[PDB]
Amino acid sequence: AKYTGKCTKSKNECKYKNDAGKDTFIKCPKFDNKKCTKDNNKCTVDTYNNAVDCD
Numbered sequence: 001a002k003y004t005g006k007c008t009k010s011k012n013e014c015k016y017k018n019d020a021g022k023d024t025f026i027k028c029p030k031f032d033n034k035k036c037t038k039d040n041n042k043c044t045v046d047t048y049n050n051a052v053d054c055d
Contacts, residue, residue: 001047006040007055014043014052028054 005016012035013027028043030036034054041055 003045003047005043005045007036007043009036009039009041012036012054014045016043016045026052028052030054 003014003016003018005014007013007028008015011025011027012030013025015023015025018024026045028036029052036055038055043055044053045051
């Protein structure tokens with residue numbers, strides 16, 4: 001499966017839903033590299049190996 005969402009300028013996390021609409025928030029791997037820079041920029045998650053991308 002897969003999921004789609006966005007990030008928060010104040011919090012670089014994927015506010016997507018898993019299972020069946022279960023609120024989930026996971027910070028993307030962007031330590032002092034790109035912790036988001038725009039309200040609801042863009043995000044994406046894959047069930048393959050929990051690969052969370054970032055805008």
